C-alpha cells in the first residue's frame, strides 16, 4: 500500500463508503462528479 497501490474503498468527498475496489472505479467512472 502506501503509494502506487490503492487500499481504500470510500469516497470521503461524496460521503459514500463502498465495499469493493472495482466498484470504486465504477463510482469514479461516472458517479463521482462529471469527469471527462
Ligand atoms: Zn465520489
UniProtKB/Swiss-Prot annotation:
Signal peptide: none annotated. A zinc finger (CCHC FOG-type) spans 3-36. Zn(2+) 1 binds at residues 11, 14, 27, 32. First expressed in stage 5 at high levels in the primordium of the amnioserosa. Also expressed in germ band extending embryos in cells of the developing anterior and posterior midgut and in hemocyte precursors present in the cephalic mesoderm. In embryonic stage 8, it is expressed in blood cell precursors. By stage 10, it is expressed in hemocyte precursors that have spread throughout the lateral and ventral head mesoderm. By stage 11, it is expressed in the dorsal ectoderm and in precursor cells of the hemocytes and fat body. It is found in: Nucleus. The CCHC FOG-type zinc fingers 1, 4 and 5 directly bind to GATA-type zinc fingers. The Tyr residue adjacent to the last Cys of the CCHC FOG-type zinc finger is essential for the interaction with GATA-type zinc fingers. Interacts with pnr, although weak this interaction is essential. Interacts with the isoform SrpNC of srp. Interacts with CtBP corepressor. Belongs to the FOG (Friend of GATA) family. Transcription regulator that modulates expression mediated by transcription factors of the GATA family such as pnr and srp. Represses transcription of proneural achaete-scute complex (AS-C), which is usually activated by pnr. Involved in cardiogenesis, blood, and eye development. During hematopoiesis, it is required to restrict the number of crystal cells, probably via its interaction with the isoform SrpNC of srp. Negatively regulates expression of sr. This is Zinc finger protein ush. It comes from Drosophila melanogaster.
Amino acid at each position: 500500500g502506501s503509494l502506487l497501490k490503492p487500499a481504500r474503498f470510500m469516497c470521503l468527498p461524496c460521503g459514500i463508503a463502498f465495499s469493493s475496489p472495482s466498484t470504486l472505479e465504477a463510482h469514479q467512472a461516472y458517479y463521482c462528479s462529471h469527469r471527462i
